[PDB]
Amino acid sequence: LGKRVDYSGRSVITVGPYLRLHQCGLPKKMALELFKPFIYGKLELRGLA
Amino acid sequence: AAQIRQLAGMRGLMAKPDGSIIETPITANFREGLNVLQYFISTHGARKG
Amino acid sequence: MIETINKLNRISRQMLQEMGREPTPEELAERMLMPEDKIRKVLKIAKEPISMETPIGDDEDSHLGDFIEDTTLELPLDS
Amino acid sequence: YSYTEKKRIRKDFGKRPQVLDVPYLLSIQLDSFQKFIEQDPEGQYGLEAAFRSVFPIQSYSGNSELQYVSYRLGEPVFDVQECQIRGVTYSAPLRVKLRLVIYEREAPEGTVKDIKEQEVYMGEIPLMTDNGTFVINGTERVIVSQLHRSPGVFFDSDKGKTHSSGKVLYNARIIPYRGSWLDFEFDPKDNLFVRIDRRRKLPATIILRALNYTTEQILDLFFEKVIFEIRDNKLQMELVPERLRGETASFDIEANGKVYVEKGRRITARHIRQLEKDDVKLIEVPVEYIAGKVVAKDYIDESTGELICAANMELSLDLLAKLSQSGHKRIETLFTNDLDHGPYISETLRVDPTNDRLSALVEIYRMMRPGEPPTREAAESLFENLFFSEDRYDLSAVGRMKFNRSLLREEIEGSGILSKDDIIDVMKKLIDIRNGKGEVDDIDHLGNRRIRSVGEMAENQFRVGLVRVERAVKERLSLGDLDTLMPQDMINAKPISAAVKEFFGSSQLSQFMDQNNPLSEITHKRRISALGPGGLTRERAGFEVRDVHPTHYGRVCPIETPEGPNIGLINSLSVYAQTNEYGFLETPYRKVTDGVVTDEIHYLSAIEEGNYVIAQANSNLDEEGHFVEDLVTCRSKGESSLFSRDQVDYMDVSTQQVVSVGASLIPFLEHDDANRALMGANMQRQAVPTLRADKPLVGTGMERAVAVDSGVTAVAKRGGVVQYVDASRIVIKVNEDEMYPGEAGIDIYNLTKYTRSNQNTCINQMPCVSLGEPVERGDVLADGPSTDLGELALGQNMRVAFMPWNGYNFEDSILVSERVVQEDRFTTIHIQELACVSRDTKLGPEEITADIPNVGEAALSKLDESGIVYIGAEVTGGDILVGKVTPKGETQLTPEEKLLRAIFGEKASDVKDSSLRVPNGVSGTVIDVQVFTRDGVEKDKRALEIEEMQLKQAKKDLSEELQILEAGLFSRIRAVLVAGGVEAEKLDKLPRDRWLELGLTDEEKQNQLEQLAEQYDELKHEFEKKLEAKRRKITQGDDLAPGVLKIVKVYLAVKRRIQPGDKMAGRHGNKGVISKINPIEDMPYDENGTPVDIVLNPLGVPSRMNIGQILETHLGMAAKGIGDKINAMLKQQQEVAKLREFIQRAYDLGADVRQKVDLSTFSDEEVMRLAENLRKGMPIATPVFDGAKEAEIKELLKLGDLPTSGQIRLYDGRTGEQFERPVTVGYMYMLKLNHLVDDKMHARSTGSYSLVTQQPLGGKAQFGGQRFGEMEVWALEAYGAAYTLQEMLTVKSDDVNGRTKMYKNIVDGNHQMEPGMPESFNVLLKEIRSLGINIELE
RNA sequence: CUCGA
Q: State the SS3 of D1064-1078.
A: EECCCCCCCEEEEEC
Q: C65–D1299: do the CB atoms touch at under 8 Å?
A: no
Contacts of D790 (CB under 8 A, 6+ apart): D4, D704, D707, D708, D713, D779, D780, D783
Q: D673–B24: do the CB atoms touch at under 8 Å?
A: no
- Residue D470's identity, in one-letter code, is E
**How many angstroms separate the CA atoms of D921 and D1283, rounded?**
35
Method: cryo-EM
CB nearest to C69's CB, from D121, D1248, D1300: D1248
User: Is residue C29 within 8 Å of C35, Cβ to Cβ?
Assistant: yes
In whole angstroms, what separates CA D481 from the centre of its chain? 50
**How many angstroms separate the CA atoms of D525 and D130, rounded?**
13
Q: Which residues of A10-32 are buried (b: 16+ CB within 10 A; e: fewer)?
A: ebbebbbeeeeeeeeeeeeeeee
The angle subtended at Cα D564 by Cα D562 and Cα D567, nearest 5°, is: 55
User: What is the full DSSP assignment across D33-62?
Assistant: THHHHS--SSS--THHHHHHHHPSEE-SSS
Q: Do B and D touch, counting CB pairs below 8 Å (3 needed)? A: yes
**How many angstroms separate the CA atoms of D54 and D43, rounded?**
17
Evaluate if the CB of D1033 falls below 7 Å from strand E. Answer: no
User: Is residue D203 within 8 Å of D209, Cβ to Cβ?
Assistant: no
Evaluate if the CB of D1225 falls below 7 Å from strand E. Answer: no
Q: Which of chain E's bases lie under 7 Å from a protein CB?
A: 1-5
How close is the nearest chain B Cα to the Cα of D548, in Å? 6
Which nucleotide is nearest, taking the CA of residue C57 and each C1'?
Answer: E1
Q: What residues of chain D lie within 8 A of the CB of C5, using their CB?
A: none
Q: What residues of chain D lie within 8 A of the CB of C70, using their CB?
A: 1248-1251, 1254
Residue of chain A whose Cα is closest to the Cα of D1258: A4
Rounded to 10°, the helix D494-506/D454-476 angle is: 160
**How many angstroms separate the CA atoms of D579 and D23, rounded?**
13
Q: A11–D1237: do the CB atoms touch at under 8 Å?
A: yes
Strands D796-802 and D1223-1232: antiparallel
Closest by CA position to D50, among listed D461, D493, D499: D461
Is residue D1137 exposed (0-12), middle (13-18) or buried (19+ Cβ within 10 Å)? exposed
Is residue C15 exposed (0-12), middle (13-18) or buried (19+ Cβ within 10 Å)? middle
**How many angstroms separate the CA atoms of D437 and D439, rounded?**
7
User: Is residue D692 within 8 Å of D1176, Cβ to Cβ?
Assistant: no
Give the 3-state secondary structure of residue B40: helix
Tally DSSP H helices, then E strands, for chain A: 2, 2
Question: Is B44 in CB contact (< 8 Å) with chain D?
Answer: yes
Helix ranges restricted to H, D125-232: 206-209, 217-222
List the single protein residue with the shortest CA to C1' distance from E4: D1235
Which residues are registered as beta bridge partners of D1243?
A9
Closest by CA position to D466, among listed D775, D120, D736: D120
Q: In angstroms, what is the C-alpha Rg of chain D?
A: 41
Q: D1262–C67: do the CB atoms touch at under 8 Å?
A: yes
**How many angstroms separate the CA atoms of D1169 and D1164, rounded?**
10
User: What is the full DSSP assignment across D474-501?
Assistant: HHHTTSS--SS--TTSS--SHHHHHHHH
State residue C73 phi and psi, 5-degree precision: -75, 140
CB nearest to A37's CB, from D1061, D1267, D1303: D1303
Helix ranges restricted to H, chain C: 2-19, 25-32, 36-42
User: Is residue A43 within 8 Å of A49, Cβ to Cβ?
Assistant: yes
**3-class DSSP string for D646-658:** CCCCEECCCCCCC
Residue D1003: how many CB atoms within 10 A of its CB? Answer: 12
User: Is residue D839 within 8 Å of D1044, Cβ to Cβ?
Assistant: yes
**How many angstroms separate the CA atoms of D144 and D524, rounded?**
7
CB nearest to A4's CB, from D921, D1075, D1264: D1264
In chain D, which residues are last before a break of more than 2.5 Å from C to the next N? Answer: none
Question: Is B28 in CB contact (< 8 Å) with chain D?
Answer: no
- Residue D328's identity, in one-letter code, is H
**How many angstroms separate the CA atoms of B38 and B26, rounded?**
6
Closest by CA position to D995, among listed D981, D741, D1004, D745: D981
Q: In angstroms, what is the C-alpha Rg of chain B?
A: 11
Is residue D1109 exposed (0-12), middle (13-18) or buried (19+ Cβ within 10 Å)? buried
Rounded to 10°, the helix D1108-1131/D1190-1197 angle is: 20
Closest by CA position to C65, among listed C50, C78, C76: C50
**How many angstroms separate the CA atoms of D1316 and D1300, rounded?**
12
How close is the nearest chain B Cα to the Cα of D652, in Å? 11
Rounded to 10°, the helix C25-32/C2-19 angle is: 110
**How many angstroms separate the CA atoms of D50 and D43, rounded?**
12
Rounded to 10°, the helix D361-368/D376-387 angle is: 70
Q: D1244–A33: do the CB atoms touch at under 8 Å?
A: yes
Q: D1308–A38: do the CB atoms touch at under 8 Å?
A: no
Give the 3-state secondary structure of residue D122: strand
Q: What residues of chain C lie within 8 A of the CB of D1300, using their CB?
A: 74, 76, 79
Q: B37–D546: do the CB atoms touch at under 8 Å?
A: no
**Which run of H or of E encompasses D1166?**
helix D1166-1172
**How many angstroms separate the CA atoms of D805 and D1112, rounded?**
22
User: Is residue D1264 within 8 Å of D1257, Cβ to Cβ?
Assistant: yes
Q: A14–D1075: do the CB atoms touch at under 8 Å?
A: yes
Mutation pick from D1075, D1234, D1307 vs chain A, by most beta carbons of A within 10 Å, is: D1307
Closest by CA position to D421, among listed D173, D211, D224, D223: D211
User: Is residue D90 within 8 Å of D135, Cβ to Cβ?
Assistant: yes
Among positive and negative, which fits the CA dihedral D383, D385, D388, D393?
negative
Q: What residues of chain C lie within 8 A of the CB of D935, using their CB?
A: 24-26
Question: Is D1077 in CB contact (< 8 Å) with chain A?
Answer: no
CA of D1097 to C1' of E3 (A): 27
Question: Is B39 in CB contact (< 8 Å) with chain D?
Answer: yes
Q: What residues of chain B lie within 8 A of the CB of D1192, using their CB?
A: none
CB nearest to D1289's CB, from A3, A8, A16: A3
User: Is residue D891 within 8 Å of D867, Cβ to Cβ?
Assistant: no
CB nearest to D675's CB, from B4, B16, B46: B46
**3-class DSSP string for D757-809:** CCCCEEECCEECCCCCCEECCCCEEEECCCEECCEECCCEEEEEEECCCCCCC
Resolution (A): 3.7
Q: D1043–C44: do the CB atoms touch at under 8 Å?
A: yes
Evaluate if the CB of C57 falls below 7 Å from strand E. Answer: yes
In chain A, which residues are last before a break of more than 2.5 Å from C to the next N? Answer: none
The HSE-up count of residue D1171 (CA atoms within 13 Å, CB side) is 30
Query: What are the angstrom distances between the C-alpha of D685 and each of B30, D520, D883, D1107?
Result: 25, 5, 40, 21
**Which run of H or of E encompasses A41?**
helix A36-45
Chain C residues with CB under 8 Å of a chain D CB are 13-14, 16-17, 20-21, 24-26, 36, 40, 43-44, 58, 65-70, 73-74, 76-77, 79
- Residue D45's identity, in one-letter code, is Y
User: Is residue D731 within 8 Å of D746, Cβ to Cβ?
Assistant: yes
- Secondary structure letter of residue D1217 according to DSSP: -
State residue D677 phi and psi, 5-degree precision: -75, -10
Residue D736: how many CB atoms within 10 A of its CB? Answer: 9
Q: C70–D1251: do the CB atoms touch at under 8 Å?
A: yes
Which residues are registered as beta bridge partners of D1039?
none
Query: What are the angstrom distances between the C-alpha of D98 and each of D58, D497, D813?
Result: 13, 18, 69
User: Subunits that touch chain D (at least 3 Cβ pairs < 8 angstroms)?
Assistant: A, B, C
Residue D1110: how many CB atoms within 10 A of its CB? Answer: 20
CATH number of D828-944+1047-1056: 2.40.50.150
